[PDB]
Amino acid sequence: PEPTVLLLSTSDTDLISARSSGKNYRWANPSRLSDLELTDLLAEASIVVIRILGGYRAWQSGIDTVIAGGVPAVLVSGEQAADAELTDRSTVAAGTALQAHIYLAHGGVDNLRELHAFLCDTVLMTGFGFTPPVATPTWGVLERPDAGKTGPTIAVLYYRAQHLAGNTGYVEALCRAIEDAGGRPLPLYCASLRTAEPRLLERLGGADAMVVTVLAAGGVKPAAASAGGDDDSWNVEHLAALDIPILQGLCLTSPRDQWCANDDGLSPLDVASQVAVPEFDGRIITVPFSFKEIDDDGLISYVADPERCARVAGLAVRHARLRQVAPADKRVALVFSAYRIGNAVGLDTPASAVALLQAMRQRGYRVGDLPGVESNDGDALIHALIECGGHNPIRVSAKEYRDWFATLPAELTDVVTAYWGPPPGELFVDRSHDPDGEIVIAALRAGNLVLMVQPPRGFGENPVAIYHDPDLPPSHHYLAAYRWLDTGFSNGFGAHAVVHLGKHGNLEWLPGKTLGMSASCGPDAALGDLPLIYPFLVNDPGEGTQAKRRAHAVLVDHLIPPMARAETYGDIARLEQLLDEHASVAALDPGKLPAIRQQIWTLIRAAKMDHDLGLTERPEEDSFDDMLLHVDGWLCEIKDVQIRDGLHILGQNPTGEQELDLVLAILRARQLFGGAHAIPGLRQALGLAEDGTDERATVDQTEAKARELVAALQATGWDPSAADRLTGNADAAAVLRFAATEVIPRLAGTATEIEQVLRALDGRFIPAGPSGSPLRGLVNVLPTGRNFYSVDPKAVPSRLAWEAGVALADSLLARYRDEHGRWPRSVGLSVWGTSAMRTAGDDIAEVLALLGVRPVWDDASRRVIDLAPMQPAELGRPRIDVTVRISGFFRDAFPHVVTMLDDAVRLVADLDEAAEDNYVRAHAQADLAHHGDQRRATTRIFGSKPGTYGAGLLQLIDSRSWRDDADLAQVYTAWGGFAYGRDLDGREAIDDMNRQYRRIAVAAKNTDTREHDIADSDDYFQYHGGMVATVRALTGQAPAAYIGDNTRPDAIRTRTLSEETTRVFRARVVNPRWMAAMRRHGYKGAFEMAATVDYLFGYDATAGVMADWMYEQLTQRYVLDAQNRTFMTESNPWALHGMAERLLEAAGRGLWAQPAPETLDGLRQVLLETEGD
Ligand code: NA
Fold first, then answer.
1. How far is the C-alpha of 627 from the C-alpha of 610, rounded, in Å?
2. What's the CA-to-centroid distance between 91 and ligand 1, angstroms?
């Protein structure tokens, strides 16, 4: 290459290929070229080649300049067919331009090298010699020497465009890491895995696992394939047929220095394209091993991180190794969540563990002789774990621990030692045998299995960290325990895989980057290359997704608990009888109405239902019957609501009456199926509106009719043809046919849940599926047993979610104005990622609706692409200010939405509107007048500290190290006083948070799923109650606290927090049907009762939701009742102790204001006997 050839191409692949060729090329992209730069380059050229799309007119100025300069010019098209005008305008022979066109059309490093010689010899009559153009295959192998490794074959799939450019260094580095891990790398390039060639799929049959760096293969419109959509259209059957693990190795389109600098690991583009959508394929999400770097010429190269290459290679080899290890030789760690061992939402963790261990033994695993496995006794198993696994014991030498600890990045070891001291720390360190230290790890070992309680996060060991350190790193004991599960320590367990039981553990919530884990990230240091298999509740998409992305988890999702109607009992049932009698007297003997009214009022007062009904006094006689219409609706709703009627056991599909009740609950909703609303609710098809206006009596009659039809269909073996014969109602018959055709066969997949855990332990491909609630008209989340995906994060809110958010906004405003006669100045709303995934964005739409901003959709992709403010005349009301508390996971998974909501606030803050029309602008102008900072004045979105998660108040309540509202607010603010949005990015903004929280008139939280309630999860009182308490601390007055009920999108309702608490209390908490159901589930059933006491306490401590009569009933039903006390004592005495302690704490703090002395004495006696038992 002596003569200089100038290559001007709008395809940077051409320019990189020319650089890779080693020939004497100059290169530039005409779209990034000034006139001076062109003439400067032309002065150095002996031959010029121009390749552009659009023909001569697309760069006429540049082409005319080259031709006028006299240098021989070769003009070719970027289109496949050559451009005859470019051929003729070239100042070489036509055949020279035509052959050059072919060299560049085929492309690749070889063709660019021969092109240089072809042009020199042809135009300048040099004598280099040249090869004709060579075709480049649509797919092929990156040829490398065989290192002779004997491990599994790991395919590496990368883009053909990178192969042609010669930018394969990032692939070579991953191949070398695979060889270092003992595997055999099979690097393959291709244009797409969606349209994969047959011979390419054949070649992949020789792989034991695949690391892919290409986009998802199932389709091109993921927004149409999520829950309720056309998931069949997302097709990866050609890749699933290989039945091997497929791991996404992340190749960031951002530079490595930015990745190292921030906790915001991936750009919003990379979150969507390399994580969220690839999850639709069932791919395992790993870490970034290469990063996009740009040089001076604007040419892109991907540069690999060798350490991250080792993590990707190690993960791939470990997953492939699973297929090679027979069950008899396979070592498995079974890890239980803690903080109360076995936390798993909706799941009977002990019974599921027994059933899993029994199935593993049957498959040939060596499960030893664990208590309760042979005897089929979940209580025996979990009691054995508590006795020998709570935090013979495993001992890790301080020397070996330090040797591993020292291999971590200083960024991580500095923080760990700053909080926990130099290794091996002071937590569970024994100096008896070795004076230098041994870290003691409690675990239950049997055969090739270890059962371990997940190590504690560490906030119990340091309550000061609750007030100041949401970013508390894992302790040395935490790290030692997980590192002992792996290989490395001389006495290491050497697990082939980890199985974590149920939603959810704390490893995937440790401090670190949002996703794209680094070597300094807590989850990465703890888990390493260990495969993680994770049974997970199907209607908790956000929490499952966090495990997928921060701990490369393979989920095996599981069914919701059995559900049934709450029904009536006790004085609620007696009130039902009196209401019916009142209706008869009204129609037949209106003069007797005062007598039956007195009976009803006596009952309401005696049973404390005036608290449920918000009645401060007796209505006037001529307003009493109108009040009973409100009682009618209240009684109907607490009787009709679905509540759990047991707990799910892994692999156990409901049968008999439990199948009937669950199918009835599923069929009650209007079905979103195949993206359409074709099948109505069963009771809708039978006459009910289900919009919140149906009369109490007709709801019961229609429910009885619906139950009769489904019970008859069940009696036929769910025969689809029996539908038309069971009812002359065409709509009802279509619903029954839908139940037999879709609901029942998909429900049947629940029996494969344990089989899919075994398949995952064997390194087989686990099929993916949608996530969400099958009680919200989303039947395609069934079958379970799948590694679920969630949503297109750029397509929220959907149009259906927009409708719901508007209804939520309208319903909240109507309730507030009805009570106060004026609009609320500001609404505070807590927004979770799991909620956006369950609903496709109801919360987000509500914020936009309150601000008066409409989303703008691209109808093709269904993605949100813009915003459009509604004018005040159309809004008909002022723009309501909104303060948003996002969770840490919402920040992680929906970065486009965080920016979207911030854009909307700034949009409406800037509109020149009157204060009476725009509360956002009014508040922003007041703040702007205070400190003059425009960005601060429009700050509305707050969340967890960057790199961290949680709201802190669960830790505070469990530590009990608090006294007043100032303490509650300080912890809440320490964990959530951080601003998000453009140029905010999680910076501390305590003063801005206080300014906005002082304005909150309504603190709102939405309940979007029926499988659990606000007394079933700590997150509601933490976020919702935490907001209430923080506003009260700042202002001295609690804001209004509302619950938005979007469990039924076609019947959105708003109620106060007090109303929702009493509804949950009567319909579930002290409902004898629910208590009896939990007493069928031993330890975990008792656990759920104790958790309910804690979460009611948490909501009372923060928002005052409890009345003394509710504490009295809670104490009697849960603790003092002989039947429940006996059950608690046998199955879970630890939970009984915690319940009595918590109720005594409520009395000590005055939250329970006037407890009877005899009742407190009974509680103290329970404490004493339980310690003695
Ligand atoms: Na010519």
1. 11
2. 5
Residues in Cβ contact with 576 at an 8 Å cutoff, skipping those fewer than 6 apart = 568, 635, 639
As a residue count, the chain comes to 1173
For CATH 3.40.50, list the domain ranges present in the chain.
5-124, 139-324
What is the Å distance from ligand 1's center to 83 Cα? Answer: 13
SS (H, E, C) 863-907: CEEEEEECCHHHHCCCECEEEEEECHHHHHHCHHHHHHHHHHHHH
- Method used to determine the 3D structure: X-ray
Per DSSP, the residues of 310-373 read HHHHHHHHHHHHHHHS-GGG--EEEEE--------TTB-HHHHHHHHHHHHHHHT---TT-TTT
The β-bridge relationship of strands 394-397 and 184-190 is unpaired
Query: Cα of 126 to ligand 1 centre, how many Å?
Result: 21
Question: How far, in Å, is the centroid of ligand 1 from the Cα of 85?
Answer: 9
Beta strand ranges found along 1040-1107 (DSSP E): 1040-1045, 1053-1056
In DSSP notation, 603-657 reads HHHHTTHHHHTT-SSPPPGGGHHHHHHHHHHHHHHHHHSEEE-S-B-TT----HH
Expressed in angstroms and rounded, the spacing between residue 88 Cα and the centre of ligand 1 is 4
Question: Residue 78 corresponds to which tokens in the numbers above?
Answer: 């970027």
Resolution (A): 1.8
CATH number, domain 139-324: 3.40.50
Residue carrying the six token digits 């000034």: 34
Return the exposure string of 122-151: e unless at least 16 CB atoms fall within 10 Å of the residue's CB, then b: bbeeeebebeebeebeebeebeeeeeebeb
- Multiple choice CATH, 5-124, 3.30.1490, 3.40.50, 3.30.420, 3.30.450: 3.40.50
* 103 CA to centre of ligand 1 in angstroms: 19
The angle, 0 to 180 degrees and rounded to 10, between the axes of the packed helices 398-405 and 476-485 is: 90
Distance 97 CA to ligand 1 centre (A): 9
